[PDB]
Amino acid sequence: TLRTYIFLDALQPQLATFIGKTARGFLPVPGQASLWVEIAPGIAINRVTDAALKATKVQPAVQVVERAYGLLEVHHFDQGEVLAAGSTILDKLEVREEGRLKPQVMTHQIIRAVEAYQTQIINRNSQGMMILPGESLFILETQPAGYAVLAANEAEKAANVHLVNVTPYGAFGRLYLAGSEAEIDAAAEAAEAAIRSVSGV
Amino acid sequence: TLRTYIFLDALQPQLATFIGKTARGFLPVPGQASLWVEIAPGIAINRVTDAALKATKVQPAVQVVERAYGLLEVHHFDQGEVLAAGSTILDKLEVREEGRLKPQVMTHQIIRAVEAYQTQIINRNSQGMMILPGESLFILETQPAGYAVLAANEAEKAANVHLVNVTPYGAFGRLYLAGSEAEIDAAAEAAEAAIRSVSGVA
Amino acid sequence: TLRTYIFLDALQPQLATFIGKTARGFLPVPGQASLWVEIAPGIAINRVTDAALKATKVQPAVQVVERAYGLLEVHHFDQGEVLAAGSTILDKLEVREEGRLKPQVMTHQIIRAVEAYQTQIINRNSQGMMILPGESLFILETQPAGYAVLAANEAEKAANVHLVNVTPYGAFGRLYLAGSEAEIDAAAEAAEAAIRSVSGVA
Amino acid sequence: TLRTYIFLDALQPQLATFIGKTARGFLPVPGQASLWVEIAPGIAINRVTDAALKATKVQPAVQVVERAYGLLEVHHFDQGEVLAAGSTILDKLEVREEGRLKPQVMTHQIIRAVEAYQTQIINRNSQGMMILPGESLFILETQPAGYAVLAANEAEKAANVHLVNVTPYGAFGRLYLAGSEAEIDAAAEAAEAAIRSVSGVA
Amino acid sequence: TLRTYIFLDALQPQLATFIGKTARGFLPVPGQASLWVEIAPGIAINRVTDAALKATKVQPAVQVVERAYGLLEVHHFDQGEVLAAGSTILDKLEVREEGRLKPQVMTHQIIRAVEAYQTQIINRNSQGMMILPGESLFILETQPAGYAVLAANEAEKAANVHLVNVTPYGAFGRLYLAGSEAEIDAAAEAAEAAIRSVSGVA
Amino acid sequence: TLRTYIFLDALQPQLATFIGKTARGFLPVPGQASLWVEIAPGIAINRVTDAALKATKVQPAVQVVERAYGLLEVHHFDQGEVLAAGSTILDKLEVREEGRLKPQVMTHQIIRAVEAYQTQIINRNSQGMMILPGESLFILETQPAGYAVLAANEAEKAANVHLVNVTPYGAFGRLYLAGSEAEIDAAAEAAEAAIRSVSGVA
Amino acid sequence: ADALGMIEVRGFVGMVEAADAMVKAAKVELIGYEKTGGGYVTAVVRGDVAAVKAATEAGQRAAERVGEVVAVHVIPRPHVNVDAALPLGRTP
Amino acid sequence: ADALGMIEVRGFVGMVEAADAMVKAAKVELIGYEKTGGGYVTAVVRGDVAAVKAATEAGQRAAERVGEVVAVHVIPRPHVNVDAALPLGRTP
Amino acid sequence: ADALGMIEVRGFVGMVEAADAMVKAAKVELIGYEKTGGGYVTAVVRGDVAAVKAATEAGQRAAERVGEVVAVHVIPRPHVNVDAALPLGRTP
Amino acid sequence: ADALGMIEVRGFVGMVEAADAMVKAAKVELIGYEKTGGGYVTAVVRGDVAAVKAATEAGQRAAERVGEVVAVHVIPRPHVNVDAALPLGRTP
Amino acid sequence: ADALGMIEVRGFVGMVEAADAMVKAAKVELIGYEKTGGGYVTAVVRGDVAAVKAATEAGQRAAERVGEVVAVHVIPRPHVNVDAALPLGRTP
């Protein structure tokens, strides 16, 4: 059951840096074309990874067999190689581009002027950049989970924010973005437009 | 969606110590009033935390984004600040006291004279005080998970027990309590009376 | 609520080694008879553990209270002692042999000649033995989770493979096996025949 | 070079619980005679452990192979078996009883009525029981680090305390104890009278 | 023997955020006056911490008893309260202001246009903000280790850089700063001019 | 000061797998020429890494700035590229080939027929392949710590054993190998012939 | 009943430092202070026997640094006629 | 159960003055006395450890005035096998 | 059957501290105490020879701090006539 | 199973005095005796390891005075294949 | 079939220590023992060739401590006529 299929054209610097900090695999560098596949059940993603690696010469970074599901990331400098790996992944699953689920948006909010007491909690439980007291915050949950990296890529692509934390796998993909208020507002507009501009089921 | 809203009059010593051991935030001291809010979906708890911290001068300890849910603890020495924070929390969600889910008691057992082979497993996978071999054990699961801290507060308040483990977040909130037989019996009676005295939506 | 009850007559060496590596409890050695009980809710497995330890002199290795469920392992050198512990476990739950859930086989695939880029990810994310590049991989998911130890036990018993990983607790029990092509094929035949030979509730 | 050879003739309950919570190998149950061996250098402890296991029936729990201090714990019900394992360990090391170092009480402090702000740091960085605010705290550093378990054993054997933490390894041996005032005073007196009454060569 | 005694009169925000991320205790907020005491030997810092907490209103975050040293951090909004805690700590240690070791800049090295192959190893072994590929890196080690937070405080106070990782405890105090070229040059100039201008005993 | 400079001209599969499991960087695959550099002091290895990455097409996996030492592992398919990175690292350090310390085997023990109680402690404290009970064990320590990977590489290159654990960094370089008796004898002979046939400063 | 703990310092400053250090170092209750004239003021804490034994020896050790301590004494059980006739804060 | 304290005086007179001062100085229970013959008698008090450490240290000084104190010792936690086989007042 | 262990202390105080340290250090059975008059009492533990050899080395070590130990001895196998004629607790 | 104690004396007189002193000085069980010919006989006691370490050191001390002791050795845990192959009295 | 390992000790006690150390240090089978008179008993282990070479040199080193080792030999392939006539525990 295909839950998420998104093709990132080029990884932004903070997104590639966060993926290389938090992944378990061949870590990406900024500027590479990426791909994210999340299927159900969680162990057939090994077969998906093997199909992609037998077809193309992409390198995988995130391949996490989760509680119920499984997310795969593959990447290469060539968009043609990454799209060929994606076509092989879709041909192995016997589905197409529209077999994925359309990402629901559970909660999107912009928190103005986050106090110090909340920032200490938020970036004790983060893995990327630190949010400072007084800076704004954008939160975002997407079901299925694999679209939060799409939101992070298209949010950093159109603004100047801090990727605090993104959880690309699990029940709900989450997203923490920090920065000034106009930049958080533009990043929130870009991220919501990028999530709502994806077809699915 | 409000799942848990429980107000604690005063944190007992072992409960405040366990929360300061296992919390991610500003640790509580004993004697402080407390407030546990668990909502769904688990990222709006940041908006709830921001509302409470803009309103009052309370200090937060536990704010854990779970797989599907989100918990919040705030605390302050004065009870009026914590109650005003709770009123601001309920106004942000536009719900009331009774909008919370009424907690089910899905397991309550008093395991008496626990052998060494079981105690070593139990307090290999706990954080609080260590249950000894031969002592008793009270177990508890409450759904939603945010009422296990109410059970731990009102169970330590009425007996002399060891808080072996409490887990206020997840699909089921768990509670481990050790001590002598009659004191575990009194704490079990107090905790079962405390969870069943909570109004809410079934 | 019973979900899994499987009696292992003898732990194979790699399975006993993996359980002693990744268990929180008294470590099993090879040659011992094992027993795996997984019930719901997650905290009544403490009562099941106490019942087994008060009845017999069996010794527990895995007693994991999961999010929504709870797993139990007990073991001893004597199959009669382990089966008496199992009889007391089934008498405490007031259920029978067939009260367990019949395990579904939700995915079984033999991935032959696994590339290096996949093996590095797999045995970065495993605890047991390591898969090398070029070796075949057998993967398996069973629902409920407690039958993956039966799958691993019989698959090592009828072949010569490497137990890369097995996760006997959770929503889905997983199994990773590595080795040569014919031996992965024989282990796959043995595991797929050993899971489907389990009676119980569909 | 033999540093620490101590024979714990009876594991007290909180000490056995702490060893089972922080143990690596086959964790013990109380009432067992234990035996701690720490040598220099720290790679010879595998041959020592193998000699003890081929000689006797003992079961090892703590066997740490760190920088050049090799710690080994073995235990069994039978004190004869534990002394036989210790004799085989001393024969395989080709040393005697008195080749161990005489233990050295370095720093013994009793901190009366510890505030809450310090207890959160103390038992956020502990493994055993929790120190509650207001309770007295006894800390202890001994040299070599392997005699801290004798200190914890006799300190629990005398007075009714809480074993907060004890570090049997490293360059120095920690011991954190918590309770009331007179009980911590009696435990500190017994631990000091048990450490420096041990024969050895400084 | 007192090694480090530095009084951070105002915590800058990224330094306060990093201390709250990596501290075991009561987290500081930006604007508070902080203090750092590092002594040798180690476990006397418990009595030092208790003396400071009984004297003043201060509220500690980093209190790490270490393999050979011991570090303490206390902080409060009132700079007079923090300085009175420092005077109490100096009186309990029976030393004065100038008894601290004068810090020594060992290795200041500016690495420019750090390639993406290296940034992942830099930040995977860090806790604070991530270094982006192409940004300059400043590394710094001072002896004693407790003055690295002074270097981090003054480097954030002068220039506009990202704090990657500061390690105030150990044999030497690391400091990783990221940012653009002129800003790393200004922050390095401020850190050099802030460390070597501290009066002490060499 | 150059402690360890060894050029692994081909990574064997289990060594490449262990490095991919325990590396904080970009993972290697079998067949690549590796290169290990260990220096003193510990933080010059960042400038060394920068120089190597700006010079050549190599890709780093292990780069650990430890308590006192610093390690670096670069690797690429082209052995000329890896030797050019080695020449760049030597020219940045301003040392030569023979400035490395000559590695000395400190301990070479074979612990044939390891009983299960020792196996569980060995493989709970390891990352590589599991050791099964009854199999032989080869422990090894080399000084400096970086030559243990050369020992593991040549030992897997000659015989057919299981790699249990190797420690490339620290004061001592450990190596645990498991297999049958003749295979462990062959791997021990090959690793001993690998270590002491390396020139350098005594 | 509750055990009795007394510090007598010639001087009001040395008594308050004693009365501050006794209630910080134990769970005792400072009930008041007695002014017997001549510069002698006397602090009284009153808790159980294990705490007042550690409070006063942390009260005497803290009050010798600032003043002149006259007498320090710990009564483990004062008689019920002592508390009923003398002002020690537990008068029935 | 409770903490165990003992005063052994060679002579019945110094034992009772030890026993009279122990029950007055702290809240203990004089459970009895053990004649061992040859002029030795042992007064046994049994309360919590904060009181019996203060009772027997005051009961010794009252018995060093009139008698001949042989041994003073306080056991804070006597084992449950001691309380069943020896007469210390807590035999089940 | 069981091995025999004995501590003899001139005084009831040093015998109970001997009897406390024996039953805490091993899995023995304190069967009683023998009063041969003149100020002598004899604590008798009786278990297996693994335990009573290590119990009475703890009973000797603790009673020498608090008294005058007369004699410490362990019999690994007492004869069938000794237990049937002397009061050692295992008389059939 | 149980531990294994052995005294080998060149001579039947020195074996029986070795065998009699082992079963008196500890709680062991003399399972038999092995006649390997040429003057060598071996007394085999077999009990727990705390007794067979005390018995065979008392069997040797009594046999060196009357005979010629060849070998004394105590096996604390003999392997299960040794008791299945060699006649030690615990053959299943 | 399987390889053949032998320890010959002048004395029964040094053989059992040899026969115990061989089955612990490898996966071998102690098939029996041969009493050829004069006090020459001989332990025979029999397993695969890499283990019996490690069993005997762990049994030779262990039997020289307590006995008189006469001969040690390991046969990698004993011929099928040897196993049919001589009693090596694999008689067809």
Q: Among candidates J69, J70, J74, J66, which has minimal Cα distance to J26?
A: J74
Cβ atoms within 10 A of the Cβ of D165, count? 22
Cα distance between residue D67 and residue D43, in whole Å = 9
Q: Same domain, yes or no, for B133 and B109?
A: yes
Q: What angle do CA C87, C88, C91 make, to 5 degrees?
A: 90
Cα distance between residue D184 and residue D178, in whole Å = 7
Measured between beta carbons, the chain D residues lying within 8 angstroms of E24 are 121, 124-125
Cα distance between residue K48 and residue B138, in whole Å = 55
Q: How many contacts (CB atoms, under 8 Å) link A and B?
A: 59
Residue from C172, C177, C184 whose CB has the most chain A CBs within 10 Å, to mutate? C172
Could you say which of H4, H36, H72 has the minimum Cβ distance to residue I39?
Answer: H36
Task: Locate D32 and state its tokens.
Answer: 């067992």
Measured between beta carbons, the chain B residues lying within 8 angstroms of D29 are 116-117, 120, 133
DSSP letters along F98-157, please? Answer: GGSBPPEEEEEEE--S--HHHHHHHHHT-SSSPPPTT-EEEEEEEESGGGHHHHHHHHHH
Compute CA distances F106 → B32, F172, F174, whole Å. Answer: 59, 9, 10
Task: Locate C138 and state its tokens.
Answer: 């057998």
Please give the torsion angle defined by the CA atoms of residues A50, A55, A57 and A58, in that order, rounded to the nearest 10 degrees.
-60
Please give the torsion angle defined by the CA atoms of residues E32, E38, E43 and E45, in that order, rounded to the nearest 10 degrees.
-40
- Comparing alpha-carbon positions, the chain I residue that sits nearest to D157 is I24
* Strand intervals (E) in A16-135: 33-39, 59-65, 70-76, 104-111
D84 neighbors D55 (Cβ within 8 angstroms): yes
Cα torsion H19, H21, H24, H27: sign? negative
Q: What are phi and psi of B68, to 5 degrees?
A: -125, -10
H40 neighbors H33 (Cβ within 8 angstroms): no
Among B54, B82, B101, identify where a domain stops.
Answer: B101
G25 neighbors G63 (Cβ within 8 angstroms): no
Which J residues 56-85 touch D at CB under 8 Å? 76-77
Cβ neighbourhood burial of A10 (10 Å; 0-12, 13-18, 19+):
middle
Q: Same domain, yes or no, for B89 and B107?
A: no
Task: Locate E103 and state its tokens.
Answer: 């810090």
Cα distance between residue C147 and residue D72, in whole Å = 36
Distance of residue D148 Cα from the nearest chain H Cα, in angstroms:
21
Asked if the bond preceding E13 is cis, omega within 30° of 0, the reply is: no
* DSSP alpha helix (H) spans, K5-79: 12-24, 49-63
D129 neighbors D164 (Cβ within 8 angstroms): yes
Q: Which residues contact A193 (CB under 8 A, 6 or more apart)?
A: A154
Q: What is the CA radius of gyration of chain B?
A: 16
Residue J90 domain-assigned (yes or no): no
Cα distance between residue I12 and residue H10, in whole Å = 11
Cβ neighbourhood burial of I32 (10 Å; 0-12, 13-18, 19+):
middle
**Which residues from F are below 8 Å from D when comparing CB atoms?**
106-107, 109, 111, 114-115, 117-118, 120-122, 124-125, 137, 139, 141, 170-172, 174
Residue G91 domain-assigned (yes or no): no
Distance of residue F81 Cα from the nearest chain A Cα, in angstroms:
20
Contact across the interface for E130 and A133, Cβ inside 8 Å: no
Cβ atoms within 10 A of the Cβ of A59, count? 19
Q: How many contacts (CB atoms, under 8 Å) link D and G?
A: 20
Contact across the interface for F112 and K50, Cβ inside 8 Å: no
List the chains bordering chain H where 3 or more Cβ pairs fall under 8 Å.
D, G, I
Measured between beta carbons, the chain E residues lying within 8 angstroms of F26 are 117, 120
Measured between beta carbons, the chain D residues lying within 8 angstroms of C26 are 26-27
Q: What is the DSSP letter of C168?
A: -
D107 neighbors E65 (Cβ within 8 angstroms): no
Contact across the interface for B25 and A120, Cβ inside 8 Å: yes
Cα distance between residue I29 and residue I40, in whole Å = 21
Q: What are phi and psi of D14, to 5 degrees?
A: -70, -35
Distance of residue H75 Cα from the nearest chain D Cα, in angstroms:
8
Q: Same domain, yes or no, for F11 and F95?
A: yes
Task: Please count the CA atoms within 13 angstroms of the CA of E30 that sit on its side-chain side.
Answer: 20
Measured between beta carbons, the chain G residues lying within 8 angstroms of H47 are none
Q: Among candidates D162, D130, D117, A167, which has minimal Cα distance to B22?
A: D130
**Which residues from E are below 8 Å from B when comparing CB atoms?**
25-27
C52: left (phi over 0), alpha (psi -120 to 50) or beta: alpha
Q: Which residues contact D185 (CB under 8 A, 6 or more apart)?
A: D110, D136
For residue D189, which amino acid is it?
E
Measured between beta carbons, the chain F residues lying within 8 angstroms of C18 are 130
Our answer on whether A and E touch (3+ beta-carbon pairs < 8 Å) is yes
Asked if the bond preceding D13 is cis, omega within 30° of 0, the reply is: no
Our answer on whether J and I touch (3+ beta-carbon pairs < 8 Å) is yes
Q: Please count the structural domains in chain K.
A: 1
Q: What is the CA radius of gyration of chain C?
A: 16
Contact across the interface for E43 and D117, Cβ inside 8 Å: no
Distance of residue E41 Cα from the nearest chain D Cα, in angstroms:
10
Cβ neighbourhood burial of E202 (10 Å; 0-12, 13-18, 19+):
exposed
G86: left (phi over 0), alpha (psi -120 to 50) or beta: beta
Residue J89 domain-assigned (yes or no): no
G88 neighbors G44 (Cβ within 8 angstroms): yes
- Comparing alpha-carbon positions, the chain C residue that sits nearest to D60 is C27
Please give the torsion angle defined by the CA atoms of residues A27, A29, A30 and A35, in that order, rounded to the nearest 10 degrees.
-40
Residue from C24, C26, C32 whose CB has the most chain D CBs within 10 Å, to mutate? C26
Cα distance between residue D86 and residue D7, in whole Å = 8
Q: What is the CATH number of the domain that holds J25?
A: 3.30.70.1710
Q: Which residues contact K36 (CB under 8 A, 6 or more apart)?
A: K42
Cα distance between residue E181 and residue E111, in whole Å = 10
Measured between beta carbons, the chain H residues lying within 8 angstroms of I41 are 36
Cα distance between residue B68 and residue B12, in whole Å = 29
Cα torsion A8, A14, A20, A23: sign? negative
- Comparing alpha-carbon positions, the chain G residue that sits nearest to D180 is G50
Q: Same domain, yes or no, for C28 and C89?
A: yes
- B190 membership: H or E segment, kind and range: helix B181-195
Contact across the interface for E14 and A117, Cβ inside 8 Å: no
Cα distance between residue F20 and residue I78, in whole Å = 66
Could you say which of I12, I32, I40 has the minimum Cβ distance to residue H34?
Answer: I12
Cα torsion C121, C122, C126, C129: sign? negative
Task: Locate E102 and state its tokens.
Answer: 């004068």
Helix, strand, coil fractions of chain E, as percent rounded to 5: 35, 30, 35
Compute CA distances H8 → B174, F6, F129, H89, I38, whole Å. Answer: 54, 76, 66, 17, 14
Beginning with the edge strand found earlier in the chain, give each strand of the sheet holding H40-47 in spatial order: H30-37, H40-47, H3-10, H69-75
Measured between beta carbons, the chain K residues lying within 8 angstroms of J40 are 11-12, 39
K44 neighbors K71 (Cβ within 8 angstroms): no
Could you say which of A118, A125, A141 has the minimum Cβ distance to residue B41?
Answer: A141
Cα distance between residue C120 and residue F158, in whole Å = 23
Task: Locate E93 and state its tokens.
Answer: 């240690």
Q: Among candidates A7, A76, A71, A27, which has minimal Cα distance to A45?
A: A71
- Determined by which method? cryo-EM
Domain extent at residue E69? 2-101
A108 neighbors A139 (Cβ within 8 angstroms): yes
Cβ neighbourhood burial of C119 (10 Å; 0-12, 13-18, 19+):
buried
Q: Same domain, yes or no, for A70 and A38?
A: yes
Q: What are phi and psi of K89, to 5 degrees?
A: 80, 0
Cα distance between residue F82 and residue F90, in whole Å = 12
Q: What is the DSSP letter of F31?
A: T
Task: Please count the CA atoms within 13 angstroms of the CA of B200 that sit on its side-chain side.
Answer: 20
List the chains bordering chain G where 3 or more Cβ pairs fall under 8 Å.
D, H
Cα distance between residue F159 and residue F14, in whole Å = 12
Cα distance between residue F86 and residue F83, in whole Å = 5
DSSP letters along H61-84, please? Answer: HHHHHHS-EEEEEEESS--TTHHH
Task: Locate J51 and state its tokens.
Answer: 């007794």
DSSP letters along E65-83, please? Answer: E-SS-EEEEEEES-HHHHH
Three-class SS of C59-70: EEEEEEECCCCE
Q: What letters, b where the CB count within 10 A reaches 16 and e where it falls short, cover A159-172?
A: bebbbbbbbbbbbb
Cα distance between residue D189 and residue A20, in whole Å = 54
Q: Same domain, yes or no, for B92 and B141?
A: no
Q: Same domain, yes or no, for D90 and D124?
A: no
Q: What are phi and psi of K44, to 5 degrees?
A: -125, 110
* Strand intervals (E) in chain I: 3-9, 30-37, 40-47, 69-75
Among A75, A101, A127, identify where a domain stops.
Answer: A101
Task: Locate K23 and state its tokens.
Answer: 């089955």
Task: Locate B187 and state its tokens.
Answer: 């704490």
Q: Same domain, yes or no, for D119 and D185?
A: yes
B8 neighbors B34 (Cβ within 8 angstroms): yes
Residue from E27, E43, E48 whose CB has the most chain D CBs within 10 Å, to mutate? E43
B23 neighbors B73 (Cβ within 8 angstroms): yes
Q: Same domain, yes or no, for C70 and C60?
A: yes
Among D80, D101, D122, identify where a domain stops.
Answer: D101
* Strand intervals (E) in A77-184: 104-111, 136-143, 162-167, 173-179
Q: Which residues contact I48 (CB under 8 A, 6 or more apart)?
A: I2, I3, J27, J48, J50
Task: Locate E95 and state its tokens.
Answer: 């030393």
Measured between beta carbons, the chain E residues lying within 8 angstroms of B28 are none
**Which residues from C are below 8 Å from D when comparing CB atoms?**
25-27
Q: What is the DSSP letter of H87?
A: -
Question: How far does Cα J41 stand from its chain's mean position?
Answer: 10
Contact across the interface for D56 and J77, Cβ inside 8 Å: yes
Q: What angle do CA C76, C77, C83 make, to 5 degrees?
A: 60
Q: Same domain, yes or no, for C150 and C97?
A: no
Cα distance between residue D19 and residue I26, in whole Å = 19
Cα distance between residue J91 and residue J83, in whole Å = 6
Could you say which of C41, C47, C60 has the minimum Cβ distance to residue B117?
Answer: C60
Measured between beta carbons, the chain A residues lying within 8 angstroms of C117 are 26, 53, 59-60
Cα distance between residue G27 and residue H35, in whole Å = 41
Cα distance between residue A140 and residue A194, in whole Å = 12
List the chains bordering chain F where 3 or more Cβ pairs fall under 8 Å.
A, C, D, E, K
Measured between beta carbons, the chain K residues lying within 8 angstroms of F112 are 25-26, 54, 58
Cα distance between residue F181 and residue C115, in whole Å = 31
For residue F145, which amino acid is it?
A
Q: Same domain, yes or no, for B30 and B64?
A: yes
Cα distance between residue C187 and residue C147, in whole Å = 15
Q: Could you tell me the end-to-end alpha-carbon distance of chain I, in angstroms, rounded to an integer?
A: 11
Distance of residue B21 Cα from the nearest chain D Cα, in angstroms:
5
Q: Among candidates D80, D186, D198, which has minimal Cα distance to D136?
A: D186
Q: Please count the structural domains in chain A.
A: 2
Cβ neighbourhood burial of E83 (10 Å; 0-12, 13-18, 19+):
middle
Q: Among candidates A27, A52, A4, A2, which has minimal Cα distance to A198?
A: A4
Q: Same domain, yes or no, for B130 and B94?
A: no
Cα distance between residue C2 and residue C95, in whole Å = 8
B127 neighbors B19 (Cβ within 8 angstroms): no
Q: What letters, b where the CB count within 10 A reaches 16 and e where it falls short, cover A21-33?
A: bbbbbbbbbbebb
Q: What are phi and psi of C165, to 5 degrees?
A: -155, 150
Cβ neighbourhood burial of G81 (10 Å; 0-12, 13-18, 19+):
exposed
Q: What is the DSSP letter of I39?
A: T
Residue I92 domain-assigned (yes or no): no
Could you say which of D44, D47, D53 has the minimum Cβ distance to residue F117?
Answer: D53
Cα distance between residue C165 and residue C121, in whole Å = 13
Q: What is the CATH number of the domain that holds A140?
A: 3.30.70.1710
Residue G90 domain-assigned (yes or no): no
Domain extent at residue G16? 1-84
Distance of residue F77 Cα from the nearest chain A Cα, in angstroms:
15
D157 neighbors D183 (Cβ within 8 angstroms): no
Measured between beta carbons, the chain J residues lying within 8 angstroms of I49 are 26-27, 50-51, 54
Cα distance between residue C158 and residue C138, in whole Å = 14
Residue G92 domain-assigned (yes or no): no
